[PDB]
Structures are given as C-alpha cells and as structure tokens.
Amino acid sequence: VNSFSGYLKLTDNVYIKNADIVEEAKKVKPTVVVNAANVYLKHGGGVAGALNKATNNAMQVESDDYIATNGPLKVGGSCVLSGHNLAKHCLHVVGPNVNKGEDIQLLKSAYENFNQHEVLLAPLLSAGIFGADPIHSLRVCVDTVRTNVYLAVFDKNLYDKLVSSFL
C-alpha cells in the first residue's frame, strides 16, 4: 500500500491522474519524482521549470554543480539528484526533444531508467514542450516500465484523451 490517491489504474503497474506534478509531489513526498530534464539540466520551462521554481532554484544550483563535475547527460539517460522539498530524490530523465530533431526511438531508453526505482511519480516523457505525441509516450511507458509508476498529467483535456484512447 502507498499514499498515491485518485489514480486510474491502466495496467498492473501503471497509474494515471489529472494532476499538477508539483502539487502532487508536495503532498505525497514520494521517494522519487521524475523530472523532464534536458542534457544540460537547464530547468527553464515545462515540467522542469515548474519543479525547479517549487524548489526556489535549489534544483538548478545543485544541477549546475552536477554538470560542472560530470558534463552533460545523454539523450535517453538520467541522473539521481536531491528531491529537495518535493521528494527524497529527483530522477532527472532526458527524453528526446522532437523540437530539436532527436530520435524518438530514444524514448524507450529514457523510460528504461524508471526500472531502477520501485515506485515513481512521473510526467509523460517527451510530452509537452518536448514535442512528442503524449499518446505514444504513454504506450512506450506501459510497454517499457515494469516498476510502479504514477503518472501526473497537467492538462485535463489531454488526460481525458489519454484515458479514452488507451488500449
């Protein structure tokens, strides 16, 4: 039993809710919140900008030190950093950004990072300002992630479309 509330169950291990991932993280304080990161960990907008703002920019400060030491992530890769006031840990995962021309096949590799964590609160990777089709992202999630994932979808209209079209 866990503390996630109001989710629709899609499969054995994937759950979905119309929710603001920031508000959801603040209430649940999950072990892992996933950030929709880029390779530079520049958290300017979308989910990343929102999560970083909620940390009062502490996420960005920590991220800048990470990059200065380690260099950029790979598209499809991830790193574990602090969850600050939102979660124990933040798993920064880089899905391909279609608005930069990155290969959508890398979306499966991106979701594979979730399998290193037993339970996660997450957005749909490569959705929103990353330019992928969220219906496709949900399909890849379901077909790739085997651990327990609680998906937060900010837009109610999109949430309803994702549920109604789910196979």
Ligand X SMILES: O=C(N[C@H]1c2ccccc2C[C@H]1C(=O)O)c1ccc(NC(=O)C2CC2)cc1
Min dist. Cβ of residue 61 to ligand X (A): 19
Strand 89-93 with 32-36, pairing: parallel
Provide φ and ψ at 149, rounded to 5°: -120, 130
Selection from 112, 96, 84 nearest residue 22 by Cα: 84
Asked if 153 touches ligand X (CB under 6 A), the answer is: yes
Instruction: Show the beta-strand stretches assigned E in 14-107.
Output: 14-18, 32-36, 78-82, 89-93
DSSP state of 127: -
How many CA atoms are closer than 13 Å to the CA of 52, on its beta-carbon side? Answer: 19
Pick the closest to residue 74 from 45, 109, 32, 42 (CA basis): 109
Count other Cβ atoms within 10 Å, centred on residue 65. 12
Pick one of 4, 111, 114, 154: the residue that binds ligand X (CB under 6 A). Answer: 154
**Contact call for residue 98 and ligand X (CB under 6 A):** no
Site for ligand X, residues 32 to 61, rule: CB under 6 A: 36, 46-47, 50
Q: Closest distance between ligand X and the C-beta of residue 132, in Å? A: 9
Query: Is residue 96 at the binding interface for ligand X, with CB under 6 A as the rule?
Result: no
Instruction: Considering only the stretches 9-17, 25-33, 56-64, 152-160, report the one whose residues sit in contact with ligand X under the rule CB under 6 A.
Output: 152-160
Among 8, 119, 129, 135, binds ligand X (CB under 6 A): 129
Shortest Å distance, C-beta 45 to ligand X = 7
Least gap, CB of 48 to ligand X (angstroms): 7
128 binds ligand X (CB under 6 A): yes
- Supply the minimum distance, in Å, between the C-beta of residue 130 and ligand X: 5
**Residue 46 vs 83, nearer CB to ligand X:** 46
**Can you tell me the distance from the alpha carbon of 113 to that of 141, in angstroms, rounded to the nearest whole number?**
11
Residues contributing to the site for ligand X (CB under 6 A): 20-22, 36, 46-47, 50, 123-124, 127-130, 153-155
